[PDB]
């Protein structure tokens, strides 16, 4: 809510090892979780998430006008996943796993 | 090409 508009800090990564996220996503069997991280430049972001145990991230693009997460443009980084949070991202993912299998039952 | 995917709601 308050913490998310423009400035954000809780799911996006931009300091710790980005590749280390894959080793942390494989330790969670049965569904993984949805996260994000920075790339090798301030002109492109990515989403690190996974299910089962086949870790896979994503690459969101951005232009000088609006951003393009995929089939929708949403210059807002939080609004981009805000509407897609309830809708389906890839052919099945849905950012519905904001935590690792441990106490979400 | 692994460790990356496109957020598209459909098989295409």
């Amino acid at each position: 809510g308050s913490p998310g508009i423009h400035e954000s800090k809780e799911w996006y990564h931009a300091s710790l090892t980005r590749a280390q996220a894959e080793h942390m996503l494989m330790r969670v069997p049965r569904d993984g979780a949805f996260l994000v991280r920075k790339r090798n430049e301030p002109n492109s972001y990515a989403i690190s998430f996974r299910a089962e145990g086949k870790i896979k991230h994503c690459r969101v693009q951005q232009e000088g006008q609006t951003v393009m997460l995929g089939n929708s443009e949403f210059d807002s980084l939080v609004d981009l996943i805000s509407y897609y949070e309830k809708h389906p991202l890839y052919r099945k993912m849905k950012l519905r796993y904001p935590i690792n299998e441990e106490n979400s039952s | 090409d692994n460790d990356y995917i496109i957020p598209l709601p459909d098989p295409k």
Side-chain angles (χ1 to χ4, degrees), chain A residues 38-54:
Chain A
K38 212 104 290 176
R39 315 275 305 323
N40 279 72
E41 38 248 300
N43 326 326
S44 33
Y45 320 71
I47 308 170
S48 28
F49 65 72
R50 188 58 217 158
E52 284 160 272
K54 235 161 110 164

Side-chain angles (χ1 to χ4, degrees), chain A residues 12 14 17 20 44 50 56-57 59 75 80 85 87 103:
Chain A
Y12 95 94
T17 21
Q20 238 219 321
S44 33
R50 188 58 217 158
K56 33 139 80 316
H57 328 147
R59 278 106 80 323
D75 228 24
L80 238 190
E85 248 268 18
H87 248 239
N103 235 117

Side-chain angles (χ1 to χ4, degrees), chain A residues 3-97:
Chain A
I5 299 119
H6 278 4
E7 248 149 55
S8 302
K9 179 165 81 246
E10 236 214 7
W11 37 299
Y12 95 94
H13 304 172
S15 288
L16 59 97
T17 21
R18 300 147 249 165
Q20 238 219 321
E22 287 88 276
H23 278 84
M24 305 235 136
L25 288 155
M26 73 98 121
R27 296 220 325 165
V28 44
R30 197 88 185 165
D31 322 319
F34 69 84
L35 300 91
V36 18
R37 71 217 260 165
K38 212 104 290 176
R39 315 275 305 323
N40 279 72
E41 38 248 300
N43 326 326
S44 33
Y45 320 71
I47 308 170
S48 28
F49 65 72
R50 188 58 217 158
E52 284 160 272
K54 235 161 110 164
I55 284 77
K56 33 139 80 316
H57 328 147
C58 103
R59 278 106 80 323
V60 176
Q61 305 288 86
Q62 175 93 253
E63 269 279 53
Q65 286 154 120
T66 344
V67 94
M68 180 155 99
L69 146 151
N71 215 39
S72 159
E73 286 90 337
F74 251 106
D75 228 24
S76 30
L77 221 129
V78 61
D79 229 22
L80 238 190
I81 239 95
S82 175
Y83 81 87
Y84 247 140
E85 248 268 18
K86 54 168 91 294
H87 248 239
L89 271 295
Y90 205 172
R91 236 302 286 164
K92 37 183 289 226
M93 271 99 247
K94 231 199 232 188
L95 321 184
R96 254 240 314 324
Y97 252 52

